[PDB]
């Protein structure tokens with residue numbers, strides 16, 4: 642029954658993630674940064690994160706709340722802002738997309754997540 646709650650949370654998180662993942666603006670965030678393509682990445686960004694990995698984490702029951710989930714979404718975003726801070730187009734584009742990923746994710750959750758559902762998730766997690 643609490644099990645039911647987390648399963649529902651997972652169903653909700655997979656759907657939101659799929660909707661972000663098929664958005665063409667967010668293509669760059671769908672897969673881990675390839676270390677051959679970007680050799681120093683794994684040096685600078687201590688905690689890589691991507692939408693692929695977010696899917697795996699959902700399935701590994703790593704998110705017990707929407708808060709936990711959005712921490713990883715924000716981490717996708719802050720990684721991009723930190724790794725790509727320059728004034729050039731390539732960096733400004735990724736940053737702009739990073740911010741849109743973040744805001745879209747929040748906006749979907751704000752319209753579609755019941756807050757009492759979140760609150761329940763939080764209270765079950767707090768009791769374990």
Ligand SMILES: Cn1c(=O)ccc2ccccc21
Nearest residue numbers: 669674675679720721724725
């Ligand atoms: C997320 N990201 C970056 O933040 C920087 C370079 C890059 C290259 C290929 C794929 C993803 C990339």
